[PDB]
Design a protein around this nucleic acid. Structure first.
Ligand SMILES: [K+]
Ligand SMILES: [K+]
Ligand SMILES: [K+]
Ligand SMILES: [K+]
Ligand SMILES: [K+]
Ligand SMILES: [K+]
Ligand SMILES: [K+]
Ligand SMILES: [K+]
Ligand SMILES: [K+]
Ligand SMILES: [K+]
Ligand SMILES: [K+]
Ligand SMILES: [K+]
Ligand SMILES: [K+]
Ligand SMILES: [K+]
Ligand SMILES: [K+]
Ligand SMILES: [K+]
Ligand SMILES: [Mg+2]
Ligand SMILES: [Mg+2]
Ligand SMILES: [Mg+2]
Ligand SMILES: [Mg+2]
Ligand SMILES: [Mg+2]
Ligand SMILES: [Mg+2]
Ligand SMILES: [Mg+2]
Ligand SMILES: [Mg+2]
Ligand SMILES: [Mg+2]
Ligand SMILES: [Mg+2]
Ligand SMILES: [Mg+2]
Ligand SMILES: [Mg+2]
Ligand SMILES: [Mg+2]
Ligand SMILES: [Mg+2]
Ligand SMILES: [Mg+2]
Ligand SMILES: [Mg+2]
Ligand SMILES: [Mg+2]
Ligand SMILES: [Mg+2]
Ligand SMILES: [Mg+2]
Ligand SMILES: [Mg+2]
Ligand SMILES: [Mg+2]
Ligand SMILES: [Mg+2]
Ligand SMILES: [Mg+2]
Ligand SMILES: [Mg+2]
Ligand SMILES: [Mg+2]
Ligand SMILES: [Mg+2]
Ligand SMILES: [Mg+2]
Ligand SMILES: [Mg+2]
Ligand SMILES: [Mg+2]
Ligand SMILES: [Mg+2]
Ligand SMILES: [Mg+2]
Ligand SMILES: [Mg+2]
Ligand SMILES: [Mg+2]
Ligand SMILES: [Mg+2]
Ligand SMILES: [Mg+2]
Ligand SMILES: [Mg+2]
Ligand SMILES: [Mg+2]
Ligand SMILES: [Mg+2]
Ligand SMILES: [Mg+2]
Ligand SMILES: [Mg+2]
Ligand SMILES: [Mg+2]
Ligand SMILES: [Mg+2]
Ligand SMILES: [Mg+2]
Ligand SMILES: [Mg+2]
Ligand SMILES: [Mg+2]
Ligand SMILES: [Mg+2]
Lengths: 139, 174
RNA sequence: GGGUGGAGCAGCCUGGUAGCUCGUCGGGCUCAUAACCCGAAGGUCGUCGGUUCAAAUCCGGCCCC
RNA sequence: GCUGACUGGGGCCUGUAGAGCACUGAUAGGGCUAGGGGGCCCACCAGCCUCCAAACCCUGUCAAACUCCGAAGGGUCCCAGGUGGAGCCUGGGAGUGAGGGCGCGAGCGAUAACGUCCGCGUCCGAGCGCGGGAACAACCGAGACCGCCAGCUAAGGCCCCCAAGUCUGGGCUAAGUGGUAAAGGAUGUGGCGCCGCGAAGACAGCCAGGAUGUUGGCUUAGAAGCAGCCAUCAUUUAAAGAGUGCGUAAUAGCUCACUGGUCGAGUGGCGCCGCGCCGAAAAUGAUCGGGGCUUAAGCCCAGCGCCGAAGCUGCGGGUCUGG
RNA sequence: UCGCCUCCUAAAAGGUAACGGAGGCGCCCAAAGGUCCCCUCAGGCGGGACGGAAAUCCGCCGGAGAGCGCAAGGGUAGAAG
RNA sequence: UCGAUGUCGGCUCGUCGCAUCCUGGGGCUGAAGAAGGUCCCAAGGGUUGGGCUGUUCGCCCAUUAAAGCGGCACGCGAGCU
């Protein structure tokens, strides 16, 4: 029972569990289209942008284990910068070229339930929130 | 590493029956002792395949003993390659003769270009106390070039050792 | 038991290199020839596996005579 | 007239079987090295380096005419047991001097012959008288003085022919194997075993996807994986061989290496044993003695019974020989 | 092919067959015979003028493989030499 | 089996085997078709006339769907030659 050379060399490599704001992490269908989601195979020395391995490995016996415990999302089992470069790397989320790049289970640290209406399909939160200077604050 | 075999006792007991029950007869003897013994064949195999006389066996005798031994003679039935007796020689004060397997890091670490190397390759008989019992002895430095004959008077010789054979056999060849 | 440079044949035996003649080619001697004295090219030695660092040169099959 | 075959105990004699390599030779591989074998700065003539290559060094064998060893058995002598259609001695009468099969050990043969020739046993011969073997001189049982409508058994048998079990248990085979002939062959079958992967989840399948400059350098009207030689570069990786398949006016279109996914339990390989299967074609009409039989009326391991001969018992008689 | 001798076959006494295997004898020696006293091989390694693998010599080593008139076997240096 | 079992070839009459020559089935093909190649099933029937020679067998002529190989005391002389 040599038990999954992945579960040592690709058990997330015991890597990037804590790195990259160890909460909030990933979702949605390890991948349908090899026709419209490019930007692999070309970053001059390595990709480091798509996925590594093994959805099923960690979704069972990778416990809370150094993230930030929050709870609200969509369903069960099926990038470094947090909540900002969401759809600025891949997966434009319906159509994206191949329809229904659907969903998963997410939890960051504050009050996120649906998250494709508020933080996924390219919103404005760090530049459009400049409306707290004379709106609802100063007469 | 050492191994263990459970080594029951026996006096009469026509040996053809011991085979008919799956148990391998043998003998246990040394300078001060000789008794009739027999082991189970099945566990003997799983052990002796790696016991491979170079290594020591404890045999953990019934009668409360635990008697360490080196295997020295195995008469396998001429017909079917299957053993039909074991000679268990009891290690005692010091020293004995024995064979020790060799490891190879010699020249040119396997052969230069696959030409004339064709050396003498097996374990070797040594004389040593029953304590400095080496697991293997690496055939050492690889400066024995094309056509060199640096014979058995040769490599490392860990602490307990003796030229128990021809001081020069042919350890390295053409 | 034979199958070798174009023809004829030696070389196998005794396995570390295939050669004479004639033909051909060119030269020597002729006044110009014939012959003659000299070399030139060319085979891998039916073919198949093995041997050996080597075998047309050892071994055995098939082949054609 | 206790001397005999056979037997017990001893004492020496032997050179087979088996094994062995020390002699005699034969022998595979390596080492180390005369002499060749070929090659070099060549004749001072010796300078090395890798098939032959004697003796020697291990490492492995072979032998009727080799033996460092060597049983069992066999022969002989002594002391004993053995009173036997036994032994010995003298003498009278013969017949026989074509043997044969079987077992074991050989030789010739072809590790052929119901072959041939010795050896030791046995049997037919002469027991072609009796039971079994279907039938059948010599295989198994057993040495037939005669009589009996009595008994027990041997080989072999007990479903019917056909006497006695369709007897008892526990396994196996599905071929009519039994009622067969081999090298070999193979998801037949039933057991023992070993390794291999698997509940962060494997083997089936059903979901996805194998995209690069992509001309892969090189080939090349073009081979842009799939006509071929491939620097088989590496840009890598949920994954993707510049390509295992079909595709092919180079492309369009297509599939499999490989991960991931759903379902969620065993899975795939190796060896062994018992029995069976293919391999399996011959000459009038078929069949294992026949009919028939398949948890047997077939094979393997137990066991209980019974049947069964001219054998042994019983009863009666006959002679012969002892006492 | 035919008598004699040696080995094998010949199955550990003797004996044992075949157009089975493989070899010899039909002589020789007045010294090769009798006896007494002596002496020990063959090879192998070094050394040694003409001498080489060897002629003869010295050294050490060498339990019998030499020799025993001729085949083979048995025997044999504590002699048969 | 020698107080006999007539030895080859032909003729006549056959019959049986199948390891099939043709005919009817069939698989694979480097099977386009046609026509073959090869292996499988199949013994029901069929399987020619001539020249040569004692011949069997062969080799030829002309044909054919094809000119099958064996067994039967190399079938068959109380049937013939
Ligand atoms: K007596
Ligand atoms: K005796
Ligand atoms: K020897
Ligand atoms: K008489
Ligand atoms: K007899
Ligand atoms: K008799
Ligand atoms: K049957
Ligand atoms: K004298
Ligand atoms: K008669
Ligand atoms: K006759
Ligand atoms: K056909
Ligand atoms: K027919
Ligand atoms: K003829
Ligand atoms: K016929
Ligand atoms: K007649
Ligand atoms: K006739
Ligand atoms: Mg006696
Ligand atoms: Mg023997
Ligand atoms: Mg012998
Ligand atoms: Mg002894
Ligand atoms: Mg007496
Ligand atoms: Mg008498
Ligand atoms: Mg006579
Ligand atoms: Mg006679
Ligand atoms: Mg006779
Ligand atoms: Mg006789
Ligand atoms: Mg007799
Ligand atoms: Mg027997
Ligand atoms: Mg006879
Ligand atoms: Mg016989
Ligand atoms: Mg015989
Ligand atoms: Mg006769
Ligand atoms: Mg008679
Ligand atoms: Mg009769
Ligand atoms: Mg009978
Ligand atoms: Mg009878
Ligand atoms: Mg009889
Ligand atoms: Mg009587
Ligand atoms: Mg009875
Ligand atoms: Mg009985
Ligand atoms: Mg009855
Ligand atoms: Mg019953
Ligand atoms: Mg049958
Ligand atoms: Mg699967
Ligand atoms: Mg039963
Ligand atoms: Mg009476
Ligand atoms: Mg009488
Ligand atoms: Mg004798
Ligand atoms: Mg005898
Ligand atoms: Mg000498
Ligand atoms: Mg001698
Ligand atoms: Mg008559
Ligand atoms: Mg008559
Ligand atoms: Mg047929
Ligand atoms: Mg047809
Ligand atoms: Mg056609
Ligand atoms: Mg005419
Ligand atoms: Mg005529
Ligand atoms: Mg005709
Ligand atoms: Mg005939
Ligand atoms: Mg005949
Ligand atoms: Mg006739």
């Amino acid at each position: 029972m040599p038990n999954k050379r992945n579960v040592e060399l690709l058990a997330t490599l015991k890597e990037n569990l804590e790195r990259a704001q160890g909460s909030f992490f990933l979702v949605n269908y390890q991948g349908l289209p090899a026709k419209e989601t490019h930007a692999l195979r070309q970053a001059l020395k390595q990709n480091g942008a798509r996925l590594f391995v093994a959805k099923n490995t960690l979704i069972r016996l990778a416990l809370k284990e150094l993230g930030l415990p929050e709870l609200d999302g969509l369903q069960g089992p099926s990038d470094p910068v947090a909540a900002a470069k969401t759809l600025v790397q891949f997966a434009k989320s319906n159509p994206k070229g191949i329809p229904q790049v659907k969903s998963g289970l997410l939890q960051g640290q504050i009050l996120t339930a649906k998250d494709v209406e508020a933080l996924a399909e390219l919103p404005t939160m760090d530049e459009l929130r400049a409306e707290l200077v004379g709106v609802l604050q100063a007469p | 590493m050492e191994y263990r075999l459970k080594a029951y006792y026996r006096e009469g007991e026509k040996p053809s029956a011991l085979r008919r029950a799956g148990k391998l007869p043998g003998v246990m003897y040394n300078r001060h002792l000789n008794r009739k013994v027999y082991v189970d064949l099945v566990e003997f195999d799983k052990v002796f395949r790696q016991a491979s006389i170079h290594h020591v066996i404890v045999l953990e005798l019934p009668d409360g003993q635990s008697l360490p031994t080196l295997v020295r003679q195995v008469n396998l039935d001429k017909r079917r390659r299957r053993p039909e007796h074991v000679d268990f020689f009891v290690l005692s004060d010091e020293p004995v003769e024995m064979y020790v397997p060799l490891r190879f890091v010699g020249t040119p670490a396997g052969v230069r270009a696959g030409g004339v190397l064709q050396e003498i390759h097996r374990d070797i008989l040594v004389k040593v106390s029953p304590r400095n019992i080496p697991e293997f002895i690496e055939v050492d430095v690889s400066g024995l070039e094309i056509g060199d004959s640096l014979h058995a008077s040769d490599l490392k010789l860990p602490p307990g050792v003796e030229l128990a054979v021809s001081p020069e056999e042919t350890i390295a060849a053409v």
